[PDB]
Amino acid sequence: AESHRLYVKGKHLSYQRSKRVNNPNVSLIKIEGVATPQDAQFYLGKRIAYVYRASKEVRGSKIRVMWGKVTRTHGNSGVVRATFRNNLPAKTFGASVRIFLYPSNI
Template identity: 50%
Template sequence: MVKGRQGERVRLYVRGTILGYKRSKLNQYPNTSLVQIEGVNTKEEVAWYAGKRLAYIYKAKVKKNGTHYRCLWGKVTRPHGNNGIVRSKFTSNLPPKSMGSRIRVFMYPRFSTHHRFTLLHHLLIQSAAFLPPRPPNRTVTPPHFYIRTTGYSTTTNQTVSRQPTIAHLSTTAPHLTHQSDHQFIRTKPPLPDTARSTTPSSDHTLCHGFSRSLLIHTICVT
């Protein structure tokens, strides 16, 4: 038994007619098409359709994905004149044979209200607030040695402590400064043991997310 329809009918789109390309006295703009929406006759009524999606469905000769029909998607950009005609742009320019054809103007919102999408550059701006500031007008030269969290290797196979802590590095290697989350670079020659102070050097900065008890696994000398 087929379940009957419940509730009132919902109209998903209204019909429209493609009038042609936008034209001036001397030029033609094929990237902008003019559409007359059915039942819209004034400029004020066009305001509700601003940004709505358009679908131009046509039949092609070559079968693709099991069908001969194709669909070009577009959107209403702005009104054109005062008699209800709108300007529209599509993913690709409409062919000349589309003039006078029917088009569907969808009435549901152009953005999904159930799924919220965030632009990538907004995420990058938000994540940049958690990164350490970059020194202005400073060129980074190739570092003499690195401290990484991936492994330990030296050119002379020297034996060094396997798990030095950041607190230990602040006193034994105060000439290191932070470059990235897992990398420190040498900025000045190491001081003699007699010239080192008990307080950590100002050139040694910690990354945001590092703690004093974090163990760095390796020191890599280049």
Template identity: 50%
Template sequence: MAIAKRLYVPGTFIGFRRSKHHQKMHTQLLNIEGVLNMEDAKCYLGKRVAIVYRNKETDATVVWGKITRTHGNSGVVRAKFDKNLCPRFMGCPVRVMLYPNRD
């Protein structure tokens, strides 16, 4: 019996980092499935993130990013992508890759 190995953990793009009056479009907030506190989120620092979406020209397009740090105490993380994400991606699923390892 073959054991299936997971390559990614699902997550959700929940919005942009913001202050009271301004929104910072260059930093996105991600909610990773199964992460409920800051200590659990720290193991995902430095991991690659992918948003896979479909458009009319190509079958699938991937936007890559990287998790930079935690955000608050509830397990939300900050990520920076190669291109700033469009606001229509809010609520879309993301894939948090389990590589590269920092060990």
């Protein structure tokens, strides 16, 4: 097993926003391979996770996770909306994100 991965690869594009006013409370996400609202429905409800590092080790681990879930589709092009427990950093715009298979309905 060269591969170990059970998530689909995703990007963090943006907060929800108008031209000139943003909303940190929702986050727009680009899910690799997904190209349409139709498609992006599959991942609604699924669990997102932003995984980052830090100096001050907490749980024996210096790796931390921001969790949240995909909530609805966005636009016409497979892009999708997410709430996280705590809104994502914004320095994270263009960072990678992880979209999981649970809660599975397959």
